[PDB]
Amino acid sequence: RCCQRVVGWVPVLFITFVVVWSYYAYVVELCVFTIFGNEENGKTVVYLVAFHLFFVMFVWSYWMTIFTSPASPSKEFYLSNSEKERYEKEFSQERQQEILRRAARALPIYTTSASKTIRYCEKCQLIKPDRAHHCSACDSCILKMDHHCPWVNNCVGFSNYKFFLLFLLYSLLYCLFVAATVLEYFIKFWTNELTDTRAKFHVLFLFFVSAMFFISVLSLFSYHCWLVGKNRTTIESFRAPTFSYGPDGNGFSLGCSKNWRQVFGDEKKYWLLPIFSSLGDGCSFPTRLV
Amino acid sequence: WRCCQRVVGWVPVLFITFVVVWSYYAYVVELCVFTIFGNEENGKTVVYLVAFHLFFVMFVWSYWMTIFTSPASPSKEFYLSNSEKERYEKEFSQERQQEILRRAARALPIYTTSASKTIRYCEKCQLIKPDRAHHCSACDSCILKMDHHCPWVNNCVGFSNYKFFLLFLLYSLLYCLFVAATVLEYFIKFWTNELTDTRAKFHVLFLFFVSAMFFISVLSLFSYHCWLVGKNRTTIESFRAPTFSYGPDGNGFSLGCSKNWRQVFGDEKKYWLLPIFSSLGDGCSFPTRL
Ligand SMILES: CCCCCCCC/C=C\CCCCCCCC(=O)OC[C@@H](O)CO
Ligand SMILES: CCCCCCCC/C=C\CCCCCCCC(=O)OC[C@@H](O)CO
Ligand SMILES: C[C@H](O)CC[C@H](C)O
Ligand SMILES: C[C@H](O)CC[C@H](C)O
Ligand SMILES: C[C@H](O)CC[C@H](C)O
Ligand SMILES: C[C@H](O)CC[C@H](C)O
Ligand SMILES: C[C@H](O)CC[C@H](C)O
Ligand SMILES: C[C@H](O)CC[C@H](C)O
Ligand SMILES: [Zn+2]
Ligand SMILES: [Zn+2]
Ligand SMILES: [Zn+2]
Ligand SMILES: [Zn+2]
């Protein structure tokens, strides 16, 4: 059929066109026509330079989140044809899990289903690694899957999670920078200290749209800051993973300081850059116990 | 006699007071009244004056509480009984002296010893030192959860005032930042000769630099203490780690980042930013990691 591309790219292009408009409105309508027209050219240069630094970090982080392909399980997590033949032909439910145990003994998996059964994906025909889940939209198993984000038309998992968090952060700073600088000129237009009708429209919407996204993404950003501190994905935050000693909402937690390092790494120079720096490989994760 | 030494302790406090009193006069009168309101910007004058007083009050309120909150001392239970105190003074063997202390310490909730595995005892105060408590030569007393003695507040920073001390810093950052950000545009205008008043030119110049100097100074102090609170270590413990029954532990009193902050700030969110006492416990016993 039309597949995701026909409609899945719609939220991306909507955000893209809003961001493109915000560039034209802030740079041309505001900085060139409004601020530079008011004979305060010093503020124009500072605003234009500062705006482009936030604009670049946002678009860079947004690009990385969209086009970073989600990681999938390695070869060891696919059932062998010998094991697949017996698994597909087996009728007894108890017998099926016994085949998995022989293959699972080689790989480092510390979690099971809510029924204490080895996590297995029927459509993908493989044994789900720890924290990995199958996405119907992505049609694949995603390592450390968080959720499918329509806004980036991609899965948010082990590969792009830090890019996703930076995409949020730089959206917060971008919207905040716009609202803070536009406010004084938004007020002047409607107290009739400034008159230009073409810029009046863009300056009003620059303030309202940036304030609408700031409030929207701030709660989302604060929520994920809590998730990273607890080392829980969005899926795990609802249905806690079941370990050998039972379900644990803190099974993958290593302490607040260590949990952030798992996502952002140990080198400070990569923390704020949308460059891959997460620890591990996405198939095995350190555990709270052993 | 001591009238020269006691008065000298108030010197750093009075210096801060005169800078703060001047900064009020400079910002409110010289800047808001004479410069901004004189510049026909009557909307900005009211907004700045209202915001300034909110930061000014929170700073002075936190600063007052840190100075005049008397430091807590050990309770009665940590003093040796008259029967035990008499024998302790008469005992000649060093090992025999520890036997009296060890027997009394078994009744008290003590989990730490000195670096020499000796029961912490204060000779001058004649009491058994509670955990994390230390004797201050300036205060001439044992201070519960002592952090350090501060010349800037002429008082010990310990279990009683530590949250007031942290809020005093926090509101110094916000006060200085608010001043520097709002004064900057008028600082620039004076020296591009868009404004002329020589009386206000002087105060606006120092308003920006003094607030920037203190901001840089207290920021490092604030970031350092934010680390201490996250690790549940006092300033003293950050140098000499406390020795527990299982040996010296730099994280002996740590309970995890979230709980360590709660120990200082409490469980009620409505008290976190107010210099009103809300710390957990009593300062004589503390939860342990093990
Ligand atoms: C000045 C303009 C700059 C704006 C750029 C900010 C970009 C923010 C991107 C996204 C914010 C969305 C706020 C979060 C809104 C989440 C609601 C949603 O999309 O539902 C999804 C689920 O129903 C799917 O099952
Ligand atoms: C424009 C308003 C001015 C706001 C004033 C903010 C008040 C900040 C209070 C103290 C800042 C000091 C930062 C510097 C702290 C120095 C470190 C110290 O330990 O000092 C003690 C030793 O020198 C022994 O005396
Ligand atoms: C010259 C102008 O007043 C400076 C603008 C700053 C960034 O606020
Ligand atoms: C633009 C951003 O502030 C760069 C930070 C890196 C870590 O240097
Ligand atoms: C500055 C003001 O006085 C603080 C309020 C407390 C309760 O006294
Ligand atoms: C005011 C302070 O930053 C918040 C403390 C809480 C417990 O994290
Ligand atoms: C000044 C500050 O907004 C007060 C917040 C407290 C927690 O109510
Ligand atoms: C949390 C602490 O108990 C608050 C005390 C004041 C009097 O309300
Ligand atoms: Zn799958
Ligand atoms: Zn997906
Ligand atoms: Zn003492
Ligand atoms: Zn002292």
Swiss-Prot record, chain B:
Keywords, in A-Z order: Acyltransferase, Cell membrane, Cytoplasm, Endoplasmic reticulum, Golgi apparatus, Host-virus interaction, Lipoprotein, Membrane, Metal-binding, Palmitate, Phosphoprotein, Transferase, Transmembrane, Transmembrane helix, Zinc
Sites annotated Important for selectivity toward medium-length fatty acids: S23, Y175
Organism: Homo sapiens (Human)
Family under the similarity heading: Belongs to the DHHC palmitoyltransferase family.
Result after altering E237A: Mildly reduced catalytic activity
Gene Ontology MF terms: palmitoyltransferase activity; protein-cysteine S-myristoyltransferase activity; protein-cysteine S-palmitoyltransferase activity; protein-cysteine S-stearoyltransferase activity; zinc ion binding
Residues that hold Zn(2+) 1 according to the record: C122, C125, H135, C142
Main enzyme class: transferase
Transmembrane segments: 9-29, 48-68, 164-184, 202-225
The protein's Enzyme Commission number: 2.3.1.225, 2.3.1.-
Gene: ZDHHC20
GO cellular component terms given for this protein: endoplasmic reticulum; endoplasmic reticulum membrane; endoplasmic reticulum-Golgi intermediate compartment membrane; Golgi apparatus; Golgi membrane; intracellular membrane-bounded organelle; membrane; perinuclear region of cytoplasm
Free-text note regarding domains: The DHHC domain is required for palmitoyltransferase activity.
Lineage: Eukaryota, Metazoa, Chordata, Craniata, Vertebrata
Protein name per Swiss-Prot or TrEMBL: Palmitoyltransferase ZDHHC20
Biological process terms in GO annotation: peptidyl-L-cysteine S-palmitoylation; positive regulation by host of viral process; protein palmitoylation; protein targeting to membrane; synaptic vesicle maturation
Effect of C150S: Loss of catalytic activity
Resulting phenotype, F165A: Loss of catalytic activity
Outcome following mutation: F265A: Mildly reduced catalytic activity
PTM text: Autopalmitoylated (in vitro).
Chief localization: Golgi
Cytoplasmic side: 69-163
Residues noted as binding Zn(2+) 2 in the record, renumbered to the chain: C136, C139, H149, C156
